[PDB]
Amino acid sequence: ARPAFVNKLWSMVNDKSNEKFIHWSTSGESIVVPNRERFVQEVLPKYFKHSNFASFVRQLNMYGWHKVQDVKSNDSRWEFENERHA
Amino acid sequence: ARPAFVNKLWSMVNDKSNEKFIHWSTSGESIVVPNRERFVQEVLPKYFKHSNFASFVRQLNMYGWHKVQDVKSNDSRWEFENERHA
DNA sequence: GGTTCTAGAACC
DNA sequence: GGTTCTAGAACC
């Protein structure tokens, strides 16, 4: 039995009906959430009760996932990568 | 399935090996703990991990049990009675 | 009231 | 790594 958060993230990134809100990158090295707000109100509520993006991000951190900061100087786009890679 | 606290209290007041530390009054209307300290170190640890008397008392309150204050003016003696009676 | 589910802790 | 236990939440 994997932790509930790991299971939920897995099912949400892989479920085809969440495609437009959260999905793997073509390479699989990261998870893409095109628009934070659409995801927060269309996907989060199906997996967590009293869900909020802040919690989601904290949880992801617990599992080694960090926000990709590659925007040079669309703050609604979020991408996550894990500390553990090949 | 009854709450874990209810089960533990039940088993500790009824278990014969805890007799000298915690037991029903002859009438059954209350629970007698002759000496708080002996009980805290001889019984509590068999039922709760990182047990302390303060928690025990709070829990008892959650279930309607209150400390009997019948000492006129042996602060080690504790007796508990429940709000719900005949 | 009693059974089934969802989780994490405990155990092997 | 996988199974079993202990709890409370969910469900009927």
Swiss-Prot record, chains A, B:
Subcellular location: Nucleus
Entry superkingdom: Eukaryota
DNA-binding region ranges: 1-86
Coiled coil location: none
Posttranslational mods: Exhibits temperature-dependent phosphorylation.
Similarity section: Belongs to the HSF family.
Subunit comment: Homotrimer. Homotrimerization increases the affinity of HSF1 to DNA.
Role this protein plays: DNA-binding transcription factor that specifically binds heat shock promoter elements (HSE) and activates transcription.
Identification of the protein by name: Heat shock transcription factor
